Amino acid sequence: SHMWIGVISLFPEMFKAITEFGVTGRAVKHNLLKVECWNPRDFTFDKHKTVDDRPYGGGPGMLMMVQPLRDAIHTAKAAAGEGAKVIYLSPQGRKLDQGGVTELAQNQKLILVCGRYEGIDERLIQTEIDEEWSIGDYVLTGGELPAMTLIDAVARFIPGVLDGLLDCPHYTRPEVLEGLTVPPVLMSGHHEEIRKWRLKQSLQRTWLRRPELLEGLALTDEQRKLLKEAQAEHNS
Amino acid sequence: SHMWIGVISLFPEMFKAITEFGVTGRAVKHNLLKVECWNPRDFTFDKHKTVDDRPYGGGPGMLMMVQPLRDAIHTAKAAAGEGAKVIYLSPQGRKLDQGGVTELAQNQKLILVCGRYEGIDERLIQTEIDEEWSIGDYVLTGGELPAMTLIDAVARFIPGVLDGLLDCPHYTRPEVLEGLTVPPVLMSGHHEEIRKWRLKQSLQRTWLRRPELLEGLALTDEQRKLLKEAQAEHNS
Ligand SMILES: c1cc(-c2ncc[nH]2)ccn1
Ligand SMILES: c1cc(-c2ncc[nH]2)ccn1
Numbered sequence: 038s039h040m041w042i043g044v045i046s047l048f049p050e051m052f053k054a055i056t057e058f059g060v061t062g063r064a065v066k067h068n069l070l071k072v073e074c075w076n077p078r079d080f081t082f083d084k085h086k087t088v089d090d091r092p093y094g095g096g097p098g099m100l101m102m103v104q105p106l107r108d109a110i111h112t113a114k115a116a117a118g119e120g121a122k123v124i125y126l127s128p129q130g131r132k133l134d135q136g137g138v139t140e141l142a143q144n145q146k147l148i149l150v151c152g153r154y155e156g157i158d159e160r161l162i163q164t165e166i167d168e169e170w171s172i173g174d175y176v177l178t179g180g181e182l183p184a185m186t187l188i189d190a191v192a193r194f195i196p197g198v199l200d201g202l203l204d205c206p207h208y209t210r211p212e213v214l215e216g217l218t219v220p221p222v223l224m225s226g227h228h229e230e231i232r233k234w235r236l237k238q239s240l241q242r243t244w245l246r247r248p249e250l251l252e253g254l255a256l257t258d259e260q261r262k263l264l265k266e267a268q269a270e271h272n273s
Numbered sequence: 274s275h276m277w278i279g280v281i282s283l284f285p286e287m288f289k290a291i292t293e294f295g296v297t298g299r300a301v302k303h304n305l306l307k308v309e310c311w312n313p314r315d316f317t318f319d320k321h322k323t324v325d326d327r328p329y330g331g332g333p334g335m336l337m338m339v340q341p342l343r344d345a346i347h348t349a350k351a352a353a354g355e356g357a358k359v360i361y362l363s364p365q366g367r368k369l370d371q372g373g374v375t376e377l378a379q380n381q382k383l384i385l386v387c388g389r390y391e392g393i394d395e396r397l398i399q400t401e402i403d404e405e406w407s408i409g410d411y412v413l414t415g416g417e418l419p420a421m422t423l424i425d426a427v428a429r430f431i432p433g434v435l436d437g438l439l440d441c442p443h444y445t446r447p448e449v450l451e452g453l454t455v456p457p458v459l460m461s462g463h464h465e466e467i468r469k470w471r472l473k474q475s476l477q478r479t480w481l482r483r484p485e486l487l488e489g490l491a492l493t494d495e496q497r498k499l500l501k502e503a504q505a506e507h508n509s
Pocket of ligand 1: 153
């Protein structure tokens, strides 16, 4: 299932970071994922290719200029054809988590709009944007890294490209590393013991580090047992 | 106040996205920010430059191979000299928010370790890593985009590079956009009316979209008043 993602950005070359390297790079090369960028700078008509503009009401900072951005978005929509969801990467957006990723990944076509400066005109959000999404409650210099993050996350759902708990600890060679040994169970070859140990560790780590994540889960009987055991061992 | 960030990554060229463009690109060019990358691949000794290894206990997936990664980290620490905090970008880490960004930005030197595959050996975390940080509860293909995100966020705190509520809506030219007008107050030139309108909008948007953020705030008398007004107007 091919995925097409249109991107609107003043810095399209940043996206080489996902299109030319690693798992996402492979997805692009193998035509599993297509990423197409439009730069508002290319839709300007003045000599100096102006892409920013002053906010009504004054104050510091600039906004993205409406006409070049609007025209870039319209061009991306035309290329997408029917059914593309238009996303504005924004601190005022819905907070991205894995549930949200799975939801966005159901779309075969996405258009991602990346803001710079103090953002974009509110009326463009109303008229051009379907959904606003935030990758986190921290402040960045532009929407490009959030767009790249979202692309990487949804790309994992495309066939051929590759449960609520934190991961268990992992171990590889050597058997002893600065005096620290590998848990003997992992050397046992007992597949079922290994599975249960890993699940128990995941439950313990989630409880200790991110206990709010547990409250959102309906633990299985097995998970309830192993969590109880982990909590008992923790309390010695 | 110069910031130095050492990066450990199998895909160092991804970091061109922040070092060659925009605000962070300027910071690098002006020597406000230095980003130095070491690639574990360069610390391998076998013919095929192997950087992954099998997990004890079996199961699918690979881990980063310990020796090349350990050697890369040691080299970065040597370059950093005294006082560098070593960060592992990890889904099992502390959740990044702006408070966390401000905390990390107090460091003049950081080393960021980027994992690939199923991650890194737990004993390396114990022996080499100071803090684990996550940029969000979503699954990515590697630690590079999180590291880049963190760099961008902390870079904003460096002098010369450039309150808990969502931003107010912003408007720029034209005065009318597909029939939608700019709020008259923003055209008034009344600086104090404009300030209060923007603050009120911020409070309203936070309440409607992210009400949990409000509970974490000690609103000023003015903010309490404007929020009450916004809620009254919302209830018509
Ligand atoms: C999405 C977008 C942003 C952002 N900051 C500046 C321009 N876009 C931050 C977090 N999630
Ligand atoms: C930090 C790191 C990650 C991550 N996923 C895969 C390797 N590193 C995800 C979120 N925050």
